[PDB]
Amino acid sequence: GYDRALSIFSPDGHIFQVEYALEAVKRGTCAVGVKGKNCVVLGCERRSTLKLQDTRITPSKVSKIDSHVVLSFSGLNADSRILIEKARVEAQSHRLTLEDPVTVEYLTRYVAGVQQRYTQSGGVRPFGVSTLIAGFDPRDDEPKLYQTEPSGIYSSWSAQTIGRNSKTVREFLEKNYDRKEPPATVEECVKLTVRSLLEVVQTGAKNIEITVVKPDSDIVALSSEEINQYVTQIEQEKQE
Amino acid sequence: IRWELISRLCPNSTGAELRSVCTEAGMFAIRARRKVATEKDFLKAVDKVISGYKKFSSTSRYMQYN
Amino acid sequence: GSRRYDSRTTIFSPEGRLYQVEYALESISHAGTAIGIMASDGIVLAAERKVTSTLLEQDTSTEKLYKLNDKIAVAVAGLTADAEILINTARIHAQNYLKTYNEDIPVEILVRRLSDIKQGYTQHGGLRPFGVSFIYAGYDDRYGYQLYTSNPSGNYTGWKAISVGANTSAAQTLLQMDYKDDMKVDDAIELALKTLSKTTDSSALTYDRLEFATIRKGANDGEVYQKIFKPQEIKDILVKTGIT
Amino acid sequence: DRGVSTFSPEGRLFQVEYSLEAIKLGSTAIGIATKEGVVLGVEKRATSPLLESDSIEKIVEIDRHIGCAMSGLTADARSMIEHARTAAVTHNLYYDEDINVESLTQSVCDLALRFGEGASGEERLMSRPFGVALLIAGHDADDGYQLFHAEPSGTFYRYNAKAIGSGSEGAQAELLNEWHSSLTLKEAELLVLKILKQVMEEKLDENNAQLSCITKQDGFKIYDNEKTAELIKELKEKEAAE
Amino acid sequence: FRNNYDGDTVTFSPTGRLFQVEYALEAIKQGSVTVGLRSNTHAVLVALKRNADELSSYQKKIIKCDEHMGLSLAGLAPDARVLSNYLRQQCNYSSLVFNRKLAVERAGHLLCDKAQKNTQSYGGRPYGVGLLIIGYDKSGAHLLEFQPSGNVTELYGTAIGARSQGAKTYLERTLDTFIKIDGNPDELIKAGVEAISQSLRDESLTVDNLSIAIVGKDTPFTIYDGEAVAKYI
Amino acid sequence: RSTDEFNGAQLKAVTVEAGMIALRNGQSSVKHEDFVEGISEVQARKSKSVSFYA
Amino acid sequence: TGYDLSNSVFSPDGRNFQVEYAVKAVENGTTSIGIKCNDGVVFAVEKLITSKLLVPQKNVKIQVVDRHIGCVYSGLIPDGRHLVNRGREEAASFKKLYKTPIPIPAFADRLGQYVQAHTLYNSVRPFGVSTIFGGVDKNGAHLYMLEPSGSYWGYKGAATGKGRQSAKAELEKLVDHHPEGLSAREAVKQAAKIIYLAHEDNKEKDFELEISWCSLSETNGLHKFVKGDLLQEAIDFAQKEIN
Amino acid sequence: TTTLAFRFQGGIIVAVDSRATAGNWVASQTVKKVIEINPFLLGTMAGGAADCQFWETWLGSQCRLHELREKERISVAAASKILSNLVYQYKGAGLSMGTMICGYTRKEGPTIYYVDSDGTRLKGDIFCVGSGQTFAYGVLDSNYKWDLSVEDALYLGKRSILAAAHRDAYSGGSVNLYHVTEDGWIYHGNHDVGELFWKVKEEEGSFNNVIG
């Protein structure tokens, strides 16, 4: 019944709703991604700070899709739930029919696929969501980081940031992550990801969540103590 | 100063905007503290006025037909 | 032609916001106030009706408190008609899980599925968003007592306390002071009447403008009990905190 | 809102005029078809030094003798590449034979036509668009190397050479002088880079350019990023002899 | 250009008019000229083929529908692709089922009846292309005029396109002559050149941009092009 | 013949437009070759845009 | 302003405006008449010769439905033809279930019910044609003229087109001259007269006359086209009368 | 109808017959029971002819369409599990399938997969399907070693089809060999089954039993 066209072309060569899509993303939360040479690190800041608000049962903004894929999302949070759902569905129907877990390349197309296909039908608004997709290719060591648009475009990155105040942290990353020399270890990368967030978080360790995915389905989160430790370290050094 | 060289680099530009590259190289000579406007102050000046005054299409709409 | 008549609920604004959704968040704050309080020793679910007339049969009515199944109760804020749809759709989904796993639905699951339904009305199909928000109060083995709230956008978050309906900012600051993490069930009862007796727009807080229900693990042999109190036991604890 | 339906009393479907703008926004794509090897080269327009150059794809394989380069929004194109891939393989099950190049263009052009109101049960699975061009290039026995230009109009022509994208106007005027009927593969490959250098925003490098051909023995083959760096280096020697 | 009525084909105007149809009629005059003339043993189409710039090739303007029938487009090229299919389809349907040559008379009326549906229903644009259908059957030779509006009429001669009147006028001064031309294939083509030169005003006549099609009592539907129209011209 | 849907005001706009073409060459007589060429200079036409799909 | 825009919305005072607008289309069309006779019915239409390029007697606008019901129309000329389809579909449907040609009063009702739908909804357009259709069956002859509103009446005679006025006044005077019903054989001749008079209106482009008749006495209830010698006698008769 | 395939050192040997009977009548003796699914998979024809030929051409299409789609060539195991799950859809419609899909990739090595009409899909080192399923097992299994010279492995295939062809009614015609390497299958061509018998009877000295 409803199929009224929402991709009214802009005479200036655009589409009004796909600009607006990009705008809604900017409103929402921030999240940063950086790829060492043997790890990926997804940090995101959490406005779930608010005395008397749990974090045990409240869902974190970094989601598990598969054993060795992880997603982080900025933009409308009602909407995030869908793209998780679809991707999970996918991940199993790939094992079923072709065997072997999803190549991180593939799953990127597939999430990207879904967001494009909401601009085609009239009955539906675009998802105002951009995402970071990360994982390690089956039985390999190749870090991969991918980010998609609510346009539907996708590309791999050395590190990227989406959400609010992405310009501050991109400008920070140009100077401080060399393109020829990734951070060597897991601790050196993590120190680098904290230092990027602590520009727009305005200190605190309670705010930020840091999850690391390594090769061989190692999805681990750093707990409050660890966060604090790293922060403090960056405090002494910086002060000195 | 080959007048063909700065006309190529520029995209499709009126003559009221091609008058403003002289005026933006004249205001950059004063910043750089030069008594001469050279072929260096015109190559920079192109980049600034083509970006700047291109972005944002006034109303970026118009139409009102259908 | 017909495109003129089309409201376009679906479309994004130049803010990127859904203007329709913001309106819906309004229609909650018109309706009467409901407060969630987590204790370690139980969950006190407490909400003061919006209705008030002197001819209301308080004994007969529930309208703010519904049971979902035996472990999970919701408190309703918004339009009651809208709500009633969602509340039946919940009840069927609870049961569907019970037939397939002989294992009562975990509280996270049930909330997540309600939230998915709501979202869908504002994705596609030019429907008007539901004007409703729930407090979810529920118990399982996994995480213990759990509290959640979902709003008409289709986005839910957990809590250690929260309030929906009118005077949301007023309620939230009273709770910020007073709640300590250790409370029993009987102290938790007393903080709930306290927070409702200041905010009430009507002058007196009366036993027939209140609905109170508990979910307690102080039922022996490791079993949980619900109980919605009668209008004649809420009267006995209104004199207990001295409101009369 | 204009309909998709409505006419402009000039005689025109407003929407087609707006589609043909979207081509021009997107990145440069040159094609020169000679009698010895079609060369397609595009400008990637890497937008940050953080972003990895080679994940971006704008030269795309349709089958093993029809290669294709796209300009415009790369998203719109994701649907139309997949439709084209299926149809060419469908034909190869059905007649055990290379799909004509001309025929494949037609099927793309047919999907392009679709953007309709979606009246009754009829399947128009788009309501809008397809703001992208193709340089569909190929080789078959019937006609030699060919090259075809698709529009979002549902309108295509053969072309000896055609530019499209941001620098289309400038590239067009250099092509009407330089194009000839005696070009070799090795001369056309160097000539494409020279016309692509003028309208490239940035300096000609292989970290914002990608070259490809289709040649009779090889089929499709995109070039190595090492080969391309060498052809850049040889252009500046010939130019610095002059 | 708005105000008043210019929305769907549903809204109907207090003037008696339906605007969208009229708009659609303007569309044909945008495209390139086509003439069509017959005699009792041969029906010819001449159309002007065009190219975007001079590296671009010409465009196919004449379409063979079958081995006894064919159309030529003027105006929109996506629209012509939808309707040429449907006349392939239907003339196939009459060889399969009834084993009869689809009569030119019938084939016009069916196209009319399909066009009507697009202007009654909400949504759907009117088809905005014009087809001159020539063809030969057991009833001799026919020429038909498809207006976008839906009307079909049989003529001895017509033109529609850009600066058509220059060709329409020539065709009326000579009406007396070309029906009496019978049996000379050559003499018929060559009259039709001198009918399309009048339209070329500010346009030079190229020989590779012209498309020519004869069908007759012994030849099937045949398009001439390239070397073959460089004999005549 | 070579005009059609010209109203009388365009046609005064053709005979004057021809005798300019005669003043540009320098001729003192306007020949039959200039009245033809003035017809293309004042038609209430310059074509909105070369066709792209018609 | 907003009742003018809309389709199938009642005006404040109570009329549908787009029914009224649909009448305009009937007056743009050329002349057509029917004449009910004692035997059956005669149909006739003015076909304008708008150019020297049209072919004679090949662009006929008279179209049968089954083999006993003549149909010719005025309004929008594609839109006519599609109601001559609709008619055929219903005609044929009746012959399958009840094995007999359809009765002429019944042919009228169902044809009308189609027109009526396109004023019920806002989504399709009110049909822009006024039709004449009729023929003979067992009850006898019947003439009908259907208006865009969805209304028909029976008639001694009826007419439509831009030259309806000039035919309406002669048609009274063919109820006075012959109050018992002239024969259909006489009425071929009388039909031509009424086209040649209502051609002064459309005197812009010269015409060609077309008659047809369906009657129980002449053609055995089989609608035909008057042709050859009988068509020549009627042409020369009305031509020399009106000059 | 003897189709066999064994894993060995250098890769896979496929071997087939070509006499395909229709009833008592022997229809044709030229029927090539290999189906080239692309240049690195070979698929046999045993079971019902129509269901087999057609459906592995269709498999050929999902290979040229997985291959473009990820730009990575199809795994041998994955190819099989396509084909299987397609014919499972139609189970109980009398379609008749017995193929081995054989390939060697650099992620799995030489691997045979055996797809069957019930939906049974087995990996394994030896399969042999059809009329000559028991004769062929027997000759082959004595003389079969995981270590072998490629040349010897070609000569082990000849002899396996040979044996089934002698005793069986519907096996006969000609023999065919293919040798899968990583790079693709190469054809080692067609030996007549009536010239081949007499070389190996004399040369080896077996089939004493046979007269002549």
Side-chain angles (χ1 to χ4, degrees), chain A residues 62-86:
Chain A
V62 189
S63 292
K64 182 179 178 181
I65 301 302
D66 200 359
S67 63
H68 65 123
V69 188
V70 293
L71 193 126
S72 194
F73 47 88
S74 301
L76 317 174
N77 294 289
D79 282 59
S80 72
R81 291 188 55 66
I82 300 171
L83 298 156
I84 303 163
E85 187 57 70
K86 304 304 190 187

PDB file of all heavy atoms in Angstrom, chain A residues 62-86:
ATOM      1  N   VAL A  62      28.860  -2.115  21.447  1.00  0.00           N
ATOM      2  CA  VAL A  62      29.619  -3.019  20.659  1.00  0.00           C
ATOM      3  C   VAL A  62      28.991  -4.365  20.777  1.00  0.00           C
ATOM      4  O   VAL A  62      28.911  -4.898  21.871  1.00  0.00           O
ATOM      5  CB  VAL A  62      31.038  -3.172  21.195  1.00  0.00           C
ATOM      6  CG1 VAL A  62      31.984  -3.985  20.237  1.00  0.00           C
ATOM      7  CG2 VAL A  62      31.633  -1.728  21.368  1.00  0.00           C
ATOM      8  N   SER A  63      28.593  -4.970  19.611  1.00  0.00           N
ATOM      9  CA  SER A  63      27.848  -6.136  19.543  1.00  0.00           C
ATOM     10  C   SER A  63      28.661  -7.256  18.954  1.00  0.00           C
ATOM     11  O   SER A  63      29.577  -7.027  18.156  1.00  0.00           O
ATOM     12  CB  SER A  63      26.560  -5.977  18.716  1.00  0.00           C
ATOM     13  OG  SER A  63      25.668  -5.084  19.427  1.00  0.00           O
ATOM     14  N   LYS A  64      28.329  -8.496  19.406  1.00  0.00           N
ATOM     15  CA  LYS A  64      28.931  -9.709  18.862  1.00  0.00           C
ATOM     16  C   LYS A  64      28.006 -10.326  17.778  1.00  0.00           C
ATOM     17  O   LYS A  64      26.831 -10.624  18.040  1.00  0.00           O
ATOM     18  CB  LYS A  64      29.181 -10.707  19.981  1.00  0.00           C
ATOM     19  CG  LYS A  64      29.847 -12.005  19.566  1.00  0.00           C
ATOM     20  CD  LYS A  64      30.052 -12.894  20.787  1.00  0.00           C
ATOM     21  CE  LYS A  64      30.673 -14.239  20.436  1.00  0.00           C
ATOM     22  NZ  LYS A  64      30.839 -15.096  21.648  1.00  0.00           N
ATOM     23  N   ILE A  65      28.507 -10.431  16.539  1.00  0.00           N
ATOM     24  CA  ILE A  65      27.750 -10.987  15.394  1.00  0.00           C
ATOM     25  C   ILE A  65      27.989 -12.462  15.229  1.00  0.00           C
ATOM     26  O   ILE A  65      27.118 -13.175  14.734  1.00  0.00           O
ATOM     27  CB  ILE A  65      28.122 -10.277  14.080  1.00  0.00           C
ATOM     28  CG1 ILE A  65      27.839  -8.775  14.186  1.00  0.00           C
ATOM     29  CG2 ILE A  65      27.357 -10.883  12.913  1.00  0.00           C
ATOM     30  CD1 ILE A  65      26.401  -8.445  14.516  1.00  0.00           C
ATOM     31  N   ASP A  66      29.189 -12.863  15.526  1.00  0.00           N
ATOM     32  CA  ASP A  66      29.673 -14.164  15.154  1.00  0.00           C
ATOM     33  C   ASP A  66      30.820 -14.272  16.150  1.00  0.00           C
ATOM     34  O   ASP A  66      31.166 -13.377  16.949  1.00  0.00           O
ATOM     35  CB  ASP A  66      30.170 -14.246  13.674  1.00  0.00           C
ATOM     36  CG  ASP A  66      30.229 -15.666  13.095  1.00  0.00           C
ATOM     37  OD1 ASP A  66      29.905 -16.637  13.804  1.00  0.00           O
ATOM     38  OD2 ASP A  66      30.519 -15.790  11.868  1.00  0.00           O
ATOM     39  N   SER A  67      31.467 -15.439  16.119  1.00  0.00           N
ATOM     40  CA  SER A  67      32.624 -15.700  16.972  1.00  0.00           C
ATOM     41  C   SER A  67      33.838 -14.825  16.741  1.00  0.00           C
ATOM     42  O   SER A  67      34.598 -14.512  17.630  1.00  0.00           O
ATOM     43  CB  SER A  67      33.043 -17.190  16.889  1.00  0.00           C
ATOM     44  OG  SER A  67      33.489 -17.717  15.628  1.00  0.00           O
ATOM     45  N   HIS A  68      34.100 -14.488  15.519  1.00  0.00           N
ATOM     46  CA  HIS A  68      35.188 -13.673  15.141  1.00  0.00           C
ATOM     47  C   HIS A  68      34.764 -12.454  14.287  1.00  0.00           C
ATOM     48  O   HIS A  68      35.558 -11.959  13.490  1.00  0.00           O
ATOM     49  CB  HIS A  68      36.177 -14.479  14.357  1.00  0.00           C
ATOM     50  CG  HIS A  68      35.577 -14.923  13.093  1.00  0.00           C
ATOM     51  ND1 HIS A  68      36.130 -14.619  11.876  1.00  0.00           N
ATOM     52  CD2 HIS A  68      34.430 -15.584  12.837  1.00  0.00           C
ATOM     53  CE1 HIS A  68      35.368 -15.104  10.922  1.00  0.00           C
ATOM     54  NE2 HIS A  68      34.324 -15.687  11.477  1.00  0.00           N
ATOM     55  N   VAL A  69      33.498 -11.972  14.359  1.00  0.00           N
ATOM     56  CA  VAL A  69      33.142 -10.637  13.856  1.00  0.00           C
ATOM     57  C   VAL A  69      32.509  -9.831  14.956  1.00  0.00           C
ATOM     58  O   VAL A  69      31.738 -10.353  15.755  1.00  0.00           O
ATOM     59  CB  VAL A  69      32.238 -10.657  12.604  1.00  0.00           C
ATOM     60  CG1 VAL A  69      32.026  -9.250  11.965  1.00  0.00           C
ATOM     61  CG2 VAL A  69      32.841 -11.588  11.556  1.00  0.00           C
ATOM     62  N   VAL A  70      32.823  -8.554  15.043  1.00  0.00           N
ATOM     63  CA  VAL A  70      32.243  -7.604  15.925  1.00  0.00           C
ATOM     64  C   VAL A  70      31.887  -6.291  15.260  1.00  0.00           C
ATOM     65  O   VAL A  70      32.602  -5.814  14.385  1.00  0.00           O
ATOM     66  CB  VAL A  70      33.088  -7.227  17.106  1.00  0.00           C
ATOM     67  CG1 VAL A  70      33.234  -8.465  18.025  1.00  0.00           C
ATOM     68  CG2 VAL A  70      34.475  -6.666  16.625  1.00  0.00           C
ATOM     69  N   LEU A  71      30.825  -5.683  15.706  1.00  0.00           N
ATOM     70  CA  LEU A  71      30.162  -4.554  15.074  1.00  0.00           C
ATOM     71  C   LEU A  71      30.139  -3.521  16.167  1.00  0.00           C
ATOM     72  O   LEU A  71      30.119  -3.885  17.349  1.00  0.00           O
ATOM     73  CB  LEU A  71      28.755  -4.883  14.553  1.00  0.00           C
ATOM     74  CG  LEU A  71      28.186  -3.785  13.611  1.00  0.00           C
ATOM     75  CD1 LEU A  71      27.759  -4.451  12.290  1.00  0.00           C
ATOM     76  CD2 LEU A  71      26.977  -3.031  14.212  1.00  0.00           C
ATOM     77  N   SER A  72      30.186  -2.246  15.728  1.00  0.00           N
ATOM     78  CA  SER A  72      29.986  -1.121  16.643  1.00  0.00           C
ATOM     79  C   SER A  72      29.188  -0.201  15.744  1.00  0.00           C
ATOM     80  O   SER A  72      29.243  -0.340  14.541  1.00  0.00           O
ATOM     81  CB  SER A  72      31.315  -0.541  17.130  1.00  0.00           C
ATOM     82  OG  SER A  72      31.043   0.324  18.253  1.00  0.00           O
ATOM     83  N   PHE A  73      28.307   0.681  16.316  1.00  0.00           N
ATOM     84  CA  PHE A  73      27.382   1.380  15.532  1.00  0.00           C
ATOM     85  C   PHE A  73      27.262   2.730  16.177  1.00  0.00           C
ATOM     86  O   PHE A  73      27.283   2.795  17.391  1.00  0.00           O
ATOM     87  CB  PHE A  73      25.978   0.715  15.491  1.00  0.00           C
ATOM     88  CG  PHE A  73      25.438   0.280  16.914  1.00  0.00           C
ATOM     89  CD1 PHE A  73      24.711   1.146  17.728  1.00  0.00           C
ATOM     90  CD2 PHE A  73      25.541  -1.073  17.295  1.00  0.00           C
ATOM     91  CE1 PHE A  73      24.301   0.747  18.992  1.00  0.00           C
ATOM     92  CE2 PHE A  73      24.976  -1.532  18.482  1.00  0.00           C
ATOM     93  CZ  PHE A  73      24.453  -0.586  19.365  1.00  0.00           C
ATOM     94  N   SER A  74      27.102   3.768  15.329  1.00  0.00           N
ATOM     95  CA  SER A  74      26.735   5.086  15.794  1.00  0.00           C
ATOM     96  C   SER A  74      25.435   5.413  15.093  1.00  0.00           C
ATOM     97  O   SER A  74      25.213   4.872  13.967  1.00  0.00           O
ATOM     98  CB  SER A  74      27.756   6.143  15.468  1.00  0.00           C
ATOM     99  OG  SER A  74      28.996   5.731  16.090  1.00  0.00           O
ATOM    100  N   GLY A  75      24.584   6.312  15.677  1.00  0.00           N
ATOM    101  CA  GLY A  75      23.387   6.803  15.030  1.00  0.00           C
ATOM    102  C   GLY A  75      22.161   6.344  15.800  1.00  0.00           C
ATOM    103  O   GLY A  75      22.274   6.058  16.992  1.00  0.00           O
ATOM    104  N   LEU A  76      20.974   6.257  15.150  1.00  0.00           N
ATOM    105  CA  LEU A  76      19.840   5.919  15.897  1.00  0.00           C
ATOM    106  C   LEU A  76      19.992   4.478  16.549  1.00  0.00           C
ATOM    107  O   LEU A  76      20.294   3.489  15.881  1.00  0.00           O
ATOM    108  CB  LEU A  76      18.541   5.959  15.118  1.00  0.00           C
ATOM    109  CG  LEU A  76      18.397   7.159  14.213  1.00  0.00           C
ATOM    110  CD1 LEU A  76      17.108   6.948  13.414  1.00  0.00           C
ATOM    111  CD2 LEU A  76      18.529   8.473  14.912  1.00  0.00           C
ATOM    112  N   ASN A  77      19.791   4.312  17.898  1.00  0.00           N
ATOM    113  CA  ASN A  77      20.011   3.061  18.676  1.00  0.00           C
ATOM    114  C   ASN A  77      18.804   2.131  18.668  1.00  0.00           C
ATOM    115  O   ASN A  77      18.968   0.935  18.930  1.00  0.00           O
ATOM    116  CB  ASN A  77      20.340   3.314  20.175  1.00  0.00           C
ATOM    117  CG  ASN A  77      21.683   4.032  20.416  1.00  0.00           C
ATOM    118  OD1 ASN A  77      22.754   3.411  20.216  1.00  0.00           O
ATOM    119  ND2 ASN A  77      21.639   5.313  20.947  1.00  0.00           N
ATOM    120  N   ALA A  78      17.624   2.635  18.391  1.00  0.00           N
ATOM    121  CA  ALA A  78      16.491   1.794  18.082  1.00  0.00           C
ATOM    122  C   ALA A  78      16.750   0.954  16.902  1.00  0.00           C
ATOM    123  O   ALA A  78      16.424  -0.200  16.849  1.00  0.00           O
ATOM    124  CB  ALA A  78      15.302   2.716  17.799  1.00  0.00           C
ATOM    125  N   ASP A  79      17.426   1.550  15.833  1.00  0.00           N
ATOM    126  CA  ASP A  79      17.718   1.030  14.565  1.00  0.00           C
ATOM    127  C   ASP A  79      18.814   0.013  14.507  1.00  0.00           C
ATOM    128  O   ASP A  79      18.790  -0.827  13.593  1.00  0.00           O
ATOM    129  CB  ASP A  79      18.148   2.212  13.586  1.00  0.00           C
ATOM    130  CG  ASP A  79      16.874   2.949  13.116  1.00  0.00           C
ATOM    131  OD1 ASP A  79      16.136   3.467  14.010  1.00  0.00           O
ATOM    132  OD2 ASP A  79      16.575   2.833  11.889  1.00  0.00           O
ATOM    133  N   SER A  80      19.794   0.124  15.430  1.00  0.00           N
ATOM    134  CA  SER A  80      20.893  -0.739  15.496  1.00  0.00           C
ATOM    135  C   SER A  80      20.550  -2.185  15.589  1.00  0.00           C
ATOM    136  O   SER A  80      21.211  -3.002  14.887  1.00  0.00           O
ATOM    137  CB  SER A  80      21.843  -0.287  16.565  1.00  0.00           C
ATOM    138  OG  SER A  80      21.340  -0.513  17.905  1.00  0.00           O
ATOM    139  N   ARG A  81      19.496  -2.507  16.357  1.00  0.00           N
ATOM    140  CA  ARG A  81      18.925  -3.818  16.625  1.00  0.00           C
ATOM    141  C   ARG A  81      18.575  -4.634  15.431  1.00  0.00           C
ATOM    142  O   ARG A  81      18.681  -5.896  15.414  1.00  0.00           O
ATOM    143  CB  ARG A  81      17.657  -3.690  17.491  1.00  0.00           C
ATOM    144  CG  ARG A  81      18.021  -3.223  18.929  1.00  0.00           C
ATOM    145  CD  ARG A  81      16.789  -3.264  19.884  1.00  0.00           C
ATOM    146  NE  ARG A  81      16.234  -4.651  19.841  1.00  0.00           N
ATOM    147  CZ  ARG A  81      16.833  -5.769  20.283  1.00  0.00           C
ATOM    148  NH1 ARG A  81      18.000  -5.753  21.005  1.00  0.00           N
ATOM    149  NH2 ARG A  81      16.238  -6.977  19.946  1.00  0.00           N
ATOM    150  N   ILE A  82      18.183  -3.964  14.325  1.00  0.00           N
ATOM    151  CA  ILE A  82      17.828  -4.577  13.116  1.00  0.00           C
ATOM    152  C   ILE A  82      19.101  -5.149  12.480  1.00  0.00           C
ATOM    153  O   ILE A  82      19.121  -6.283  12.002  1.00  0.00           O
ATOM    154  CB  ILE A  82      17.148  -3.701  12.101  1.00  0.00           C
ATOM    155  CG1 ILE A  82      15.830  -3.133  12.709  1.00  0.00           C
ATOM    156  CG2 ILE A  82      16.793  -4.556  10.821  1.00  0.00           C
ATOM    157  CD1 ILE A  82      15.063  -2.057  11.946  1.00  0.00           C
ATOM    158  N   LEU A  83      20.149  -4.287  12.329  1.00  0.00           N
ATOM    159  CA  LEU A  83      21.256  -4.655  11.507  1.00  0.00           C
ATOM    160  C   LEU A  83      22.061  -5.749  12.124  1.00  0.00           C
ATOM    161  O   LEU A  83      22.678  -6.636  11.484  1.00  0.00           O
ATOM    162  CB  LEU A  83      22.175  -3.440  11.257  1.00  0.00           C
ATOM    163  CG  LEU A  83      21.492  -2.244  10.495  1.00  0.00           C
ATOM    164  CD1 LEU A  83      22.138  -0.900  10.730  1.00  0.00           C
ATOM    165  CD2 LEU A  83      21.162  -2.589   9.038  1.00  0.00           C
ATOM    166  N   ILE A  84      22.060  -5.829  13.503  1.00  0.00           N
ATOM    167  CA  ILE A  84      22.494  -6.975  14.250  1.00  0.00           C
ATOM    168  C   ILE A  84      21.784  -8.265  13.939  1.00  0.00           C
ATOM    169  O   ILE A  84      22.436  -9.298  13.925  1.00  0.00           O
ATOM    170  CB  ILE A  84      22.422  -6.724  15.773  1.00  0.00           C
ATOM    171  CG1 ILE A  84      23.263  -5.494  16.200  1.00  0.00           C
ATOM    172  CG2 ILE A  84      22.926  -8.010  16.541  1.00  0.00           C
ATOM    173  CD1 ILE A  84      22.836  -5.006  17.639  1.00  0.00           C
ATOM    174  N   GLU A  85      20.461  -8.178  13.788  1.00  0.00           N
ATOM    175  CA  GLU A  85      19.579  -9.235  13.601  1.00  0.00           C
ATOM    176  C   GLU A  85      19.800  -9.871  12.281  1.00  0.00           C
ATOM    177  O   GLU A  85      20.181 -11.016  12.216  1.00  0.00           O
ATOM    178  CB  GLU A  85      18.054  -8.918  13.778  1.00  0.00           C
ATOM    179  CG  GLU A  85      17.040 -10.085  13.735  1.00  0.00           C
ATOM    180  CD  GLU A  85      17.319 -11.150  14.747  1.00  0.00           C
ATOM    181  OE1 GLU A  85      17.126 -10.853  15.974  1.00  0.00           O
ATOM    182  OE2 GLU A  85      17.815 -12.247  14.374  1.00  0.00           O
ATOM    183  N   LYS A  86      19.733  -9.061  11.231  1.00  0.00           N
ATOM    184  CA  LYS A  86      20.051  -9.487   9.919  1.00  0.00           C
ATOM    185  C   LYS A  86      21.382 -10.053   9.717  1.00  0.00           C
ATOM    186  O   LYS A  86      21.542 -10.932   8.859  1.00  0.00           O
ATOM    187  CB  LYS A  86      19.972  -8.403   8.875  1.00  0.00           C
ATOM    188  CG  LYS A  86      18.662  -7.617   8.693  1.00  0.00           C
ATOM    189  CD  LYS A  86      17.483  -8.576   8.423  1.00  0.00           C
ATOM    190  CE  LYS A  86      16.254  -7.722   7.994  1.00  0.00           C
ATOM    191  NZ  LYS A  86      15.105  -8.663   7.905  1.00  0.00           N
TER     192      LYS A  86
END
